[PDB]
Design an enzyme around this catalytic site. Structure first.
Site, PDB file in Angstrom:
ATOM      1  CB  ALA A  26      -0.895  -0.004   1.222  1.00 29.73           C
ATOM      2  CB  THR A  29       5.638  -1.015  -6.137  1.00 33.91           C
ATOM      3  OG1 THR A  29       6.633  -1.086  -7.160  1.00 33.91           O
ATOM      4  CG2 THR A  29       4.722   0.144  -6.432  1.00 33.91           C
ATOM      5  CG  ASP A 141      13.851  -4.203  13.147  1.00 35.48           C
ATOM      6  OD1 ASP A 141      14.208  -5.363  13.391  1.00 35.48           O
ATOM      7  OD2 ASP A 141      12.818  -3.946  12.507  1.00 35.48           O
ATOM      8  NE  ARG A 145      12.241  -9.488  10.838  1.00 41.19           N
ATOM      9  CZ  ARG A 145      12.210  -8.583  11.801  1.00 41.19           C
ATOM     10  NH1 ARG A 145      12.056  -7.309  11.503  1.00 41.19           N
ATOM     11  NH2 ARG A 145      12.329  -8.949  13.058  1.00 41.19           N
ATOM     12  CG  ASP A 159      14.044  -2.282   7.743  1.00 42.19           C
ATOM     13  OD1 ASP A 159      13.814  -1.906   8.903  1.00 42.19           O
ATOM     14  OD2 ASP A 159      13.149  -2.386   6.889  1.00 42.19           O
TER      15      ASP A 159
HETATM   16  C1  LIG Z   1      12.880 -11.602   3.352  1.00 44.96           C
HETATM   17  C2  LIG Z   1      12.333 -10.222   3.647  1.00 44.96           C
HETATM   18  C3  LIG Z   1      12.506  -9.369   2.415  1.00 44.96           C
HETATM   19  O1  LIG Z   1      12.377  -9.844   1.299  1.00 44.96           O
HETATM   20  N1  LIG Z   1      12.799  -8.102   2.651  1.00 44.96           N
HETATM   21  C4  LIG Z   1      12.935  -7.316   1.599  1.00 44.96           C
HETATM   22  C5  LIG Z   1      12.562  -7.748   0.342  1.00 44.96           C
HETATM   23  C6  LIG Z   1      12.702  -6.903  -0.747  1.00 44.96           C
HETATM   24  C7  LIG Z   1      13.214  -5.631  -0.571  1.00 44.96           C
HETATM   25  C8  LIG Z   1      13.370  -4.773  -1.631  1.00 44.96           C
HETATM   26  N2  LIG Z   1      14.574  -3.984  -1.398  1.00 44.96           N
HETATM   27  C9  LIG Z   1      14.542  -2.868  -0.662  1.00 44.96           C
HETATM   28  O2  LIG Z   1      13.494  -2.488  -0.164  1.00 44.96           O
HETATM   29  N3  LIG Z   1      15.658  -2.161  -0.480  1.00 44.96           N
HETATM   30  C10 LIG Z   1      15.547  -1.089   0.295  1.00 44.96           C
HETATM   31  C11 LIG Z   1      15.021   0.085  -0.189  1.00 44.96           C
HETATM   32 CL1  LIG Z   1      14.539   0.241  -1.703  1.00 44.96          CL
HETATM   33  C12 LIG Z   1      14.922   1.161   0.662  1.00 44.96           C
HETATM   34  O3  LIG Z   1      14.409   2.285   0.160  1.00 44.96           O
HETATM   35  C13 LIG Z   1      13.901   2.959   1.305  1.00 44.96           C
HETATM   36  C14 LIG Z   1      15.318   1.108   1.975  1.00 44.96           C
HETATM   37  C15 LIG Z   1      15.838  -0.080   2.428  1.00 44.96           C
HETATM   38  O4  LIG Z   1      16.244  -0.218   3.702  1.00 44.96           O
HETATM   39  C16 LIG Z   1      15.261   0.435   4.505  1.00 44.96           C
HETATM   40  C17 LIG Z   1      15.955  -1.180   1.603  1.00 44.96           C
HETATM   41 CL2  LIG Z   1      16.567  -2.561   2.178  1.00 44.96          CL
HETATM   42  C18 LIG Z   1      15.729  -4.356  -1.912  1.00 44.96           C
HETATM   43  C19 LIG Z   1      15.927  -5.671  -2.294  1.00 44.96           C
HETATM   44  C20 LIG Z   1      17.142  -6.042  -2.828  1.00 44.96           C
HETATM   45  N4  LIG Z   1      17.389  -7.282  -3.206  1.00 44.96           N
HETATM   46  C21 LIG Z   1      16.415  -8.172  -3.251  1.00 44.96           C
HETATM   47  C22 LIG Z   1      16.354  -9.030  -4.328  1.00 44.96           C
HETATM   48  C23 LIG Z   1      15.365  -9.987  -4.413  1.00 44.96           C
HETATM   49  C24 LIG Z   1      14.440 -10.091  -3.404  1.00 44.96           C
HETATM   50  N5  LIG Z   1      13.488 -11.009  -3.491  1.00 44.96           N
HETATM   51  C25 LIG Z   1      12.539 -11.192  -2.393  1.00 44.96           C
HETATM   52  C26 LIG Z   1      12.217 -12.648  -2.209  1.00 44.96           C
HETATM   53  N6  LIG Z   1      11.886 -13.293  -3.478  1.00 44.96           N
HETATM   54  C27 LIG Z   1      11.596 -14.701  -3.202  1.00 44.96           C
HETATM   55  C28 LIG Z   1      13.044 -13.238  -4.361  1.00 44.96           C
HETATM   56  C29 LIG Z   1      13.372 -11.819  -4.705  1.00 44.96           C
HETATM   57  C30 LIG Z   1      14.498  -9.242  -2.317  1.00 44.96           C
HETATM   58  C31 LIG Z   1      15.492  -8.281  -2.236  1.00 44.96           C
HETATM   59  N7  LIG Z   1      18.110  -5.147  -2.975  1.00 44.96           N
HETATM   60  C32 LIG Z   1      17.913  -3.838  -2.597  1.00 44.96           C
HETATM   61  N8  LIG Z   1      16.698  -3.467  -2.059  1.00 44.96           N
HETATM   62  C33 LIG Z   1      13.583  -5.201   0.683  1.00 44.96           C
HETATM   63  C34 LIG Z   1      13.440  -6.043   1.769  1.00 44.96           C
END
Ligand SMILES: *CCC(=O)Nc1ccc(CN(C(=O)Nc2c(Cl)c(OC)cc(OC)c2Cl)c2cc(Nc3ccc(N4CCN(C)CC4)cc3)ncn2)cc1
Length: 299
Positions: A26, A29, A141, A145, A159
């Protein structure tokens, strides 16, 4: 007293191509995607987070003030901000972590995770936290995860939604120190506790801490003196370390500097400290021509 000199970068939507959805909410994305600097002639794999077009005026600040934080850190083991885009929605651009969640990862490869790999992870996360410590910063935190896998060899912390300057004023619970649960009190030492729990998660291939118990009781439990159990793969030396983290007196708790060191020690004879069936029979892994990694971009 120190002045935050961090540069914050503004990017143009045309410099980056969203490829596919990683997460949806919500709130917004997040896209797997690419970013091409105009001059640079390099492609960089990014995660692009884009608040839903409807914008909560309170909500928008929420993410900026996260980007404020990320921007202020540069480390091998800390997920850095690449920049932001002031489109009608505001888009945030960080470094892509292809294997995603560490928590997931270990669940997905529990059969394939080498003892050495875990010890490596442990260190690395300690190096991460000891950095946030140095920068006078408290994650607030830490959890399995919230660690992200760039590659199996490398993980980075993430995070810091809740991050605060130490002594600053302004719920997993299960990961949270006792000091925190009763008193909403947080310290690096508090983070050390949540580090302990994090290690436990890894050493149990991503198992739920205190599975069964409603978070209410935990506070009492810890007063009794109970903690999580030793994982099966864990030698006493490893478990022993986790436990130290979970002391009530937080000055007794180890320092992230120490933990780095102790796990680094164990890093060298992996199989002396983790017993995993068939340890040494395990291994883990359109036009990506000009592609480079962010960690390799440092103007
Ligand atoms: C297991 C829990 C989980 O999946 N947590 C999680 C998933 C996906 C994301 C997306 N990413 C992200 O939010 N990064 C990010 C961003 Cl954009 C911001 O902007 C504010 C802030 C913060 O920190 C607050 C973070 Cl971390 C994200 C993801 C990734 N790599 C990635 C690749 C693939 C997948 N994925 C999820 C599971 N399926 C099965 C496969 C594909 C997840 C993440 N890199 C960079 N950012 C964030 C957290």
């Amino acid at each position: 007293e120190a002045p935050n000199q961090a540069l914050l970068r503004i990017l143009k939507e045309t410099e980056f191509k969203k490829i596919k959805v990683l997460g949806s909410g919500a709130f917004g994305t997040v896209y797997k995607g690419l970013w091409i600097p105009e001059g640079e002639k390099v492609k960089i794999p990014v995660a692009i987070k884009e608040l839903r077009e409807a914008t909560s005026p309170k909500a928008n600040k929420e993410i900026l003030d996260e980007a404020y934080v990320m921007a202020s850190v540069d480390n091998p083991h800390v997920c850095r901000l690449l920049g932001i885009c002031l489109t009608s929605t505001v888009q945030l651009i960080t470094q892509l972590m292809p294997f995603g969640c560490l928590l997931d990862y270990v669940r997905e490869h529990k059969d394939n995770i080498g003892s050495q790999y875990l010890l490596n992870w442990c260190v690395q996360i300690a190096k991460g936290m000891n950095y946030l410590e140095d920068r006078r910063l408290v994650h607030r935190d830490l959890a399995a995860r919230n660690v992200l896998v760039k590659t199996p060899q490398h993980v980075k912390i993430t995070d810091f939604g809740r991050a605060k300057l130490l002594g600053a004023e302004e719920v997993p619970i299960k990961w949270m120190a006792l000091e925190s649960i009763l008193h909403r009190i947080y310290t690096h030492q508090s983070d050390v506790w949540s580090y302990g729990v994090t290690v436990w998660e890894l050493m149990t291939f991503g198992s739920k801490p205190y599975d069964g118990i409603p978070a209410s009781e935990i506070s009492s439990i810890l007063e009794k003196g109970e903690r999580l159990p030793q994982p099966p793969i864990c030698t006493i030396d490893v478990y022993m370390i986790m436990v130290k983290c979970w002391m009530i007196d937080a000055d007794s708790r180890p320092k992230f500097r120490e933990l780095i060191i102790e796990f680094s020690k164990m890093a060298r004879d992996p199989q002396r400290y983790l017993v995993i069936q068939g340890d040494e029979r395990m291994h883990l892994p359109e036009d990506m021509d000009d592609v480079v990694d962010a960690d390799e971009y440092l103007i």
